[PDB]
Design a protein around this ligand. Structure first.
Ligand SMILES: CCC(=O)SCCNC(=O)CCNC(=O)[C@H](O)C(C)(C)COP(=O)(O)OP(=O)(O)OC[C@H]1O[C@@H](n2cnc3c(N)ncnc32)[C@H](O)[C@@H]1OP(=O)(O)O
Ligand SMILES: CCC(=O)SCCNC(=O)CCNC(=O)[C@H](O)C(C)(C)COP(=O)(O)OP(=O)(O)OC[C@H]1O[C@@H](n2cnc3c(N)ncnc32)[C@H](O)[C@@H]1OP(=O)(O)O
Ligand SMILES: CCC(=O)SCCNC(=O)CCNC(=O)[C@H](O)C(C)(C)COP(=O)(O)OP(=O)(O)OC[C@H]1O[C@@H](n2cnc3c(N)ncnc32)[C@H](O)[C@@H]1OP(=O)(O)O
Ligand SMILES: CC(C)(COP(=O)(O)OP(=O)(O)OC[C@H]1O[C@@H](n2cnc3c(N)ncnc32)[C@H](O)[C@@H]1OP(=O)(O)O)[C@@H](O)C(=O)NCCC(=O)NCCS
Lengths: 439, 439, 452, 439
């Protein structure tokens, strides 16, 4: 049986195309079993700890126990075939049904920040909708991505699936990626990555879903539970060392509570920098001459980042915290590091205005800690982000401590929000004229 | 006050950008009032007849009485703000809400086959979802498009809307269209047109909705009500002179009812060509050297077409009918003329196979006449079309004799199905952690 | 196989709705509902629209509103104008009759809302015309006929409404007697309706006695309960808006409506600021114990119950009856009393609004749960704290909960959602609509029409 | 710790009142653990086998193999807390949420035909909705019911549930029932039983749901797959020896295919009686002179029934078939036995009219075998049954080979259809005025 890995992109696409044709002859029960099969692969404790541990060691980014939670989140709260609902309308003209049907072959680009959660997430959703998927993994995570694909192909083969429902290439590269985007038998492109690769898949003449970039602010006003907010903000900021694109990247605190917030942040493992000389070193380490993030510090722990400036702290420190002006490079930039600047503002209305401004119109993600229903409503409505989290860690926006399903492909410019099976399906309308209206 | 027509595409876009930002401050009541303004513009009897006269006069395509019905269908059955529904989940983690929020400025490309209906239905849904729209109409329908835009802007001014919610250019052209595709302030493209213009919009780096092409076959098996099927097939095929994208374009009939079906088709106004010489005359009239459809014949009545080959008939003749092999140009090509080839096949399973094959994987529209629930199920399920109509004219898939709403932007390649306000909105998730779970 | 297909050879003075006997009314409704099953959904929709036109016709709108106040002595013309129009515009139609679909390997399952048959509806003297408009739209949209047993105190306005409905439905080609009543309403006739074998379902909008009775008849019954809606205000509320909303909700139709505020439970640190804004919004505050006692004499019977002589009269009127003259800006009578005061414990249905001062927001919630007497009908809260709004709504478990608005926002007037005037109490249907008056049917197409 | 069994009805109601108050403070996650616990009890292979044969042994009704299927259906396909959905509506006036909330203590009356499945189905749905349940079981299934209640109380005790979530009485009697209906703390009665007990619970001054009686016809017309129809009809009629209240109980066949159907009926396990003397023996055995069914024969097998009249057949015989006029006692009566009268009629429309007539305006369950979508629509629309199955066995209407969920409390007069958790909840509406409209 094929393990799903192919030497060329064209060979993988052609096998996925044959596989999806065979897939159309499978029942919905087969789909459910295949979906459950993919959950069982990642939710198996040894494979969970293998994938989490293996991604840290090969990418050098993130940390092990947080990938346990993300990988389990993907396998547990990704919607299966139940996502493919049916609408019906019956009256004098008959019955109309609206269904979610497969697209065909979907090419899927996966990131080095969430290599396995994206594959688990994309695979389950795309296979639920009746598609086959070709993965072009990130080269920094190519061995952990390939191992997951091989494990999935073994499980699906064991469960009776057509071979090659989930395929990838042996040597991931952007050259294979560009061949995937050009291939006539790829009917849909899904890019989870930075804004360059998303613009690329929206330029190939075919249906594309692209993730978005975000610089998520978290506002805290005087009505918030400060103790809980500090716990949630540390947890959300240091989650997988600030790799997730929903992770908090600057605090905008109302002055009335800012100090007591900083106090409680420190209690939860924030390391506060007050010396501008120490702050200067950290700027020179984590930023280029550009002013933006430096790749070698992305995804690193706070303990690690601090050791590089000669400060030795134990494992209880999870984030590095500093109060700075709004113009500081750490607020304007999307560092993807557990370095959390705090801007002090006079009023909640000022906090909302700055949060909107600092969000750079990404319309991606924003967080607020407030119990005032009017202020929660006002900031949510104005900032207009794909995800908005009130009184919890940012990752509650993905189903970890918040209601709803989870995903690791969050659409930016294409508008689908948190993708699921439904997002990988074509809507069909079936009209039974003057019959089956049995009301 | 501005009338909506700008001299340059740049001026139209930026004015639409200003408008959409003002629009963001309006209530849902204001949207509902503006949506009702657009309906009133097109449903006013004088404008309704003026828009249908001008469209035929200016494009030469379609007929007045049927554009009267299609424009009214766009004004009455296009969804409004009630299309913008809300999802809610509540439990131990609080409340999650999912809303349909505005995109921004939408660039919409409109066809010469359906200029006013596309503008009416694009406008309603895009404005219901809180966007502004820049229209880039087809030059063959410039005068009627701009009048309709100016009428919309006038009525919206009377309603107190932000100026320039609906805009276009004075002299529409392909270069204005390309300027609209390139403009950074256009957040989404919507193209109702041929395969080329849909590939263009999917190659711009933006989100695009593309309403592709079809070759809708109609299968008639031995269990059908043949009398009713003949009436439906003529009515659907000839509706607005075969201009609509769903209109019947070739019959595939089981051999045992084929003759009786033809007799009934003739009974309902199909002119049958038996003489092979006359049939060759028609082929040379309506097909170019490369075998493609002649533009001068698109949307012409059967009376006109037959007159061009020396046959004089009265207004009761609605389509031209001919039995031919499956390889015949009228089968393989999409003609958009009330010319309806018939292909005779041995069994209903042969008919389904040929229908799938001749449809050319457009997965757009198919029609079946059959009272056999298993063959209806099999054909609908196998052919995987965006619209499938059972025992009805093709336009029962547009809300005219079938259950559901109407659209004139039917997305094949991009998978949205029958577009409406939802299709022109971003999806946003709002997570209220550990609160508002009042069950 | 057939060479010509399969044709469909087998597919092919006026009553005013008022009857001298309940049994003739029921029998006429039974025949009507059978004819109705031959009508199309389009017919249902024109008939539903025709009911809306009766009550939203400006003449009839004014006539029904004014006539109900003249006939009953309860309520006021301007608000019944608003309530009748609310029933006319925001009562769901046939769109309420949604279809559930499930498709997969075993085919297609459809779930539809189909007619019960003859419904007998008991309507109250408080909202005679709104309940009749609201029931008739919902019940006919679902494909039923309805027999009305109205209250004798509202006989004329109810018989007139049923007659006007029957005239309009006649003009629309409806089967006669889709909506009927009796010429002489009575408790005798109501009992006869509850007992009649051809009545498939009973819908009662009234007090607990009549709700208990319909649940004792051996047939399907919807019971629309009652309660004593508390309005809780805490220190996070917008007090200037709370006071305005509280005056408006309490004085709506002179505190008749099923949801109207009936006691304020105020957090002490904002209590006096609340009272100050309540008087600014048209509250007459009684502070003199002598005068407060005079009003108790007037509005309470010897048995400690409310005087029906005073139910639904304005605050102007009630103050005039104790020698206090005030102009039309006074909308409610307001007084601060202990939690056991009769005005708190009873349900007066009068624009009389006791305020009880408590210490914390958690005491306000506990008291609101207590004074609601486990009706779990309605409660209101003014508060911006998303935790306290959640705690109160979750704990008090009312059918309707309104946050930071007048109570009547729970019926579609200033709040999202549709309207109704039959709010189910014991039987748990919530805000009744066409769906509530339907049988749920399941049609299973085995291994066909799974076209996904 | 309590085992759930109480000496007096009042003690069980008083215990269940305290339990449900305690249940209110449990979480939705607790309910899900308690619902999964009940599924784990009945789906345990040892308990499943014991529950299915102890029911047969104590009641003398049904058969072992089929109760395995039915208890499996109750445990697997009964909806859980996911049944309690949430409606939201947002706009200028804010947010409105609608939720499904507990009633309190529910008194449930279970039948002798489906004692254990009803207890599994009721308690799962009632506990998902946040209720406790006092069962008042049928006296002849006393010992299997109390065992199930004890096993349930043991599992929940192991899950940390409040004591007495599911309770019953030590000696089931109808006077214990009469205590349950009168107890004021019982906020809702649910009677799964005959027409007397249903009228009773509807005469108590409380909210009541009541099961339905039906005389379910199965029409077969000349368009049906007769091989499959006969196989489905035998399997459906003999399912648990015709005990379920959806089972086929008279065939109304179109004459043109009647003899071919009887042929396939016989091949699938139907023993046809043709001799009128043998037929009269069967009536005296299974009927009284009142006309009513003999309780001694209810739920018995076809082999057992034929044995009493001296006829010896093997276990391949599943039902007893006889062609009779429409007025025959087996047509008019409701035998709940694997006895299947067949009526011959000329036309499918006569079959439909006869089906309607013989159903006795119960509007409960009806079946049709036909491939004509017009005739399936006509019969379904006109007969207005709570369940309607097309082209499958009766039990496909309960989710066994048909789409949808399963129940064993099918409402008759009270209208709720197939009960689930929703049916045991109060609809509450929460209105947030001018806030949380975050669209
Ligand atoms: C809540 C969780 C979520 O929301 S999931 C979405 C999170 N993932 C992302 O946002 C991905 C973007 N992240 C970044 O760009 C970061 O800066 C980091 C992690 C540093 C990226 O590492 P870096 O070493 O700079 O490489 P790169 O990703 O920028 O890519 C460089 C070139 O390779 C390409 N590339 C990217 N991914 C793939 C892929 N899966 N397969 C094939 N090619 C890939 C890029 O397009 C880029 O190409 P080029 O430089 O233009 O030649
Ligand atoms: C019924 C529901 C619906 O979907 S609404 C109708 C949808 N209409 C379609 O799918 C396309 C049907 N029309 C056509 O195919 C052709 O236009 C017809 C009328 C048949 C004849 O083509 P012809 O006479 O040569 O005109 P053309 O469109 O090919 O030439 C225009 C070229 O300019 C471009 N163009 C297309 N639309 C616009 C527009 N609105 N504004 C500016 N430019 C436009 C196109 O690129 C087109 O060139 P090209 O032929 O596509 O290569
Ligand atoms: C599709 C799957 C389904 O629909 S299954 C659920 C549908 N409902 C049923 O199957 C109920 C079965 N309906 C029937 O008519 C049964 O055939 C029989 C056994 C005849 C019911 O009649 P019934 O009088 O109740 O039985 P019986 O002769 O043994 O006498 C019992 C007496 O006790 C009563 N009873 C009934 N259930 C209970 C109970 N759980 N607890 C206490 N009492 C009960 C009965 O009313 C009867 O009393 P009485 O004869 O009226 O004085
Ligand atoms: C409004 C109210 C003041 C009625 O005025 P009233 O004069 O005090 O009450 P009445 O004595 O005239 O009517 C009640 C009696 O008539 C019966 N009754 C109620 N409605 C009836 C009807 N439509 N037809 C016949 N009898 C009816 C009741 O069962 C009751 O009988 P009982 O007192 O012997 O037990 C008040 O008593 C009430 O009934 N409130 C509940 C109504 C309500 O709030 N409906 C919700 C509005 S949407």
């Amino acid at each position: 049986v094929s393990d799903g890995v192919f030497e060329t992109m064209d060979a993988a696409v052609e096998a996925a195309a044959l596989a999806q044709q065979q897939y159309l002859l499978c029942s919905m029960s087969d789909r459910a079993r295949f979906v459950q099969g993919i959950r069982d692969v990642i939710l198996n404790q040894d494979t969970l700890e293998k994938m989490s541990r293996m991604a840290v060691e090969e990418t050098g980014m993130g940390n092990y126990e947080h990938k346990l939670i993300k990988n389990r989140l993907a396998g547990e709260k990704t919607p299966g075939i139940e996502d493919l609902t049916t609408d019906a309308f019956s009256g004098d003209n008959g019955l109309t049904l609206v269904e979610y049907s497969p697209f065909g072959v979907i090419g899927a680009i996966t990131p080095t920040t969430n290599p396995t959660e994206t594959i688990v997430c994309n695979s389950i959703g795309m296979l639920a909708a009746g598609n086959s998927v070709v993965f072009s993994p990130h080269p920094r995570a190519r061995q952990v991505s390939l191992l997951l694909v091989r494990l999935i192909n073994q499980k699906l083969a064991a469960l009776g699936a057509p071979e090659n429902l989930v395929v990838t290439v042996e040597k991931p590269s952007i050259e294979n990626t560009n061949a995937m985007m050009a291939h006539p038998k790829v009917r849909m492109l899904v890019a989870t990555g930075g804004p360059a690769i998303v613009k690329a898949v929206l330029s190939t003449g075919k249906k594309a879903i692209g993730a978005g970039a975000g610089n998520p602010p978290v506002v805290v006003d005087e009505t918030a539970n400060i103790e809980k907010a500090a716990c949630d903000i540390v947890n959300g900021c240091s989650f997988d060392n600030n790799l997730p694109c929903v992770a908090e990247k600057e605090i905008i605190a109302v002055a009335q509570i800012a100090d007591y917030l900083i106090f409680n942040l420190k209690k939860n493992g924030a390391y506060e920098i007050k010396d501008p000389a120490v702050l200067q070193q950290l700027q020179d380490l984590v930023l280029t001459a550009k002013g933006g993030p430096q790749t070698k510090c992305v995804g690193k722990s706070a303990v690690w980042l601090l050791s590089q400036i000669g400060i030795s702290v134990d494992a209880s420190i999870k984030i590095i915290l500093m109060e700075v002006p709004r113009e500081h490079p750490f607020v304007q930039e999307e560092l993807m590091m557990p370095i959390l600047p705090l801007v002090r503002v006079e009023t909640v209305d000022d906090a909302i205005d700055l949060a909107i401004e600092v969000e750079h119109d990404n319309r991606h993600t924003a967080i607020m800690h407030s119990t005032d229903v009017r202020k929660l409503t006002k900031m949510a409505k104005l900032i207009q982000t794909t995800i908005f989290v009130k009184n919890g860690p940012s990752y509650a926006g993905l189903g970890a401590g918040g209601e709803g399903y989870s995903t690791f492909t969050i659409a930016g410019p294409t508008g689908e929000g948190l993708t699921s099976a439904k997002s990988f399906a074509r809507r069909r309308k079936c009209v039974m004229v003057e019959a089956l209206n049995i009301r």
